[PDB]
Amino acid sequence: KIRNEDLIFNESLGQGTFTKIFKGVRREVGDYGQLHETEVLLKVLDKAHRNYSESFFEAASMMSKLSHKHLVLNYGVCVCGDENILVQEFVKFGSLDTYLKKNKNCINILWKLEVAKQLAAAMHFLEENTLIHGNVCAKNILLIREEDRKTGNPPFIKLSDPGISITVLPKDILQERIPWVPPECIENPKNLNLATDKWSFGTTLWEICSGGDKPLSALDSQRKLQFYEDRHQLPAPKAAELANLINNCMDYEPDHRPSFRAIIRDLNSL
């Protein structure tokens, strides 16, 4: 819980679902009483959508009861003014979807495998804690550190918070989030379960293999609906080394989707 007076808003970085995102600075007393001015990620709920404030905050709160090297750090909230603001660590290299687009001509199978293994590790941690994320996608993966072939250092990613839950979002927004949202949640958003994240994880691997293309982007909401109704799978990406794993995770039967331990074992065997 942070004071408005300790936060300075700077440039807009974009928007999420019913939110606006800004780079910012938090003035804080840190360890040993040292004063720090810390770059922060600020997510502001749209005032016009103040109805979603509880879910907006339950999303960040749920994940911050657990600590983990691959889960993004949340500093707190500022409920100052009429604004609802999430204060989050600022990651140097932004989200994975934009990173994959701007760097497509420099991302090989080894880089992808390390990113997929780290994301599976985070999801395995969540599965063991029976915590549903609900919005696994490339936009919610943050790149802390780039790969450095010189020092052999692999990339390092974190999973960000899910945003407002699909269990309260309007149906046309859910439909636009096909194929990250699983078919059982399109049928009924309250079908959100651990198996939800395995499907979305599969969709996210497709993103990682497709240079930041969005799967099914050419299809409007009604065609996305019918895609599920006809039980189609995503096309294999040209870089097809993860296609079987993608299809295994994107199983129309939720009970058949493999555990993240089995997913990690599959990744390790490639």
How many other C-beta atoms can be found within 10 angstroms of the C-beta atom of residue 191? 16
The interface region with ligand VPS, picked from 13-21, 47-55, 167-175, 260-268 by CB under 6 A, is 13-21
Instruction: Say whether residue 98 binds ligand VPS (CB under 6 A).
Output: yes
Buried b / exposed e across 55-67, counting CB within 10 Å, b at 16+?
bbbbbbebbbeee
Instruction: Say whether residue 100 binds ligand VPS (CB under 6 A).
Output: no
155 and 145 Cβ atoms separated by less than 8 Å:
yes
Beta bridge partners of 157: 143
Q: Alpha helix locations (H) across the chain?
A: 53-64, 96-102, 109-128, 171-176, 183-187, 194-209, 221-229, 243-249, 260-268
Please give the structure tokens belonging to residue 236: 């294999």
Instruction: Say whether residue 159 binds ligand VPS (CB under 6 A).
Output: no
Smallest separation, CB 74 to ligand VPS (Å) = 9
Interface with ligand VPS (CB under 6 A), residue total 14
Kindly tell me which residue out of 28, 83, 89, 266 binds ligand VPS, with binding defined by CB under 6 A: 89
Name the residue whose CB lies closest to ligand VPS: 94
Smallest separation, CB 156 to ligand VPS (Å) = 13
Instruction: Say whether residue 64 binds ligand VPS (CB under 6 A).
Output: no
Nearest-10 crossing angle of helices 109-128, 260-268? 160
Kindly tell me which residue out of 22, 75, 90, 201 binds ligand VPS, with binding defined by CB under 6 A: 90
Instruction: Say whether residue 91 binds ligand VPS (CB under 6 A).
Output: yes
Please give the structure tokens belonging to residue 149: 């072939």
Instruction: Say whether residue 41 binds ligand VPS (CB under 6 A).
Output: yes
Kindly tell me which residue out of 17, 74, 95, 135 binds ligand VPS, with binding defined by CB under 6 A: 95
Beta bridge partners of 9: 24
Instruction: Say whether residue 14 binds ligand VPS (CB under 6 A).
Output: yes
Kindly tell me which residue out of 94, 154, 254, 258 binds ligand VPS, with binding defined by CB under 6 A: 94
143 and 118 Cβ atoms separated by less than 8 Å:
no
Binding interface with ligand VPS (CB under 6 A): 13-14, 21, 41, 72, 88-91, 94-95, 98, 142, 160
